[PDB]
Amino acid sequence: YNYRYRLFRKSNLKPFERDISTEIYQAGSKPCNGVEGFNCYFPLQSYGF
């Protein structure tokens, strides 16, 4: 269940980039910053293979 992908980034990456930025981001514009909550979330998940 382990092949990861990124679901949120502040912008799309450049050609052949391998960025490992992984912070919480805004669905509502709330500075949750290092912590999750409803309307603000962490950016990675993996396929249930």
Partner: protein, 49 residues
């Protein structure tokens, strides 16, 4: 479930800034954005069930 409540809307403005009467959408699931702050989406998918 057995006979779910369909609905639709059209010819009006809209926003995720008004997506729910509580921002704690305790059963929500959103490929757009959950209820808080957004304001930029459109479709022929006027459905609003």
């Amino acid at each position: 479930v057995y006979a779910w409540n369909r609905k639709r809307i059209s010819n009006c403005v809209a926003d995720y800034s008004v997506l729910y009467n509580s921002a704690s959408f305790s059963t929500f699931k959103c490929y757009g954005v959950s209820p808080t702050k957004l304001n930029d989406l459109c479709f022929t998918n006027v459905y609003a069930d």
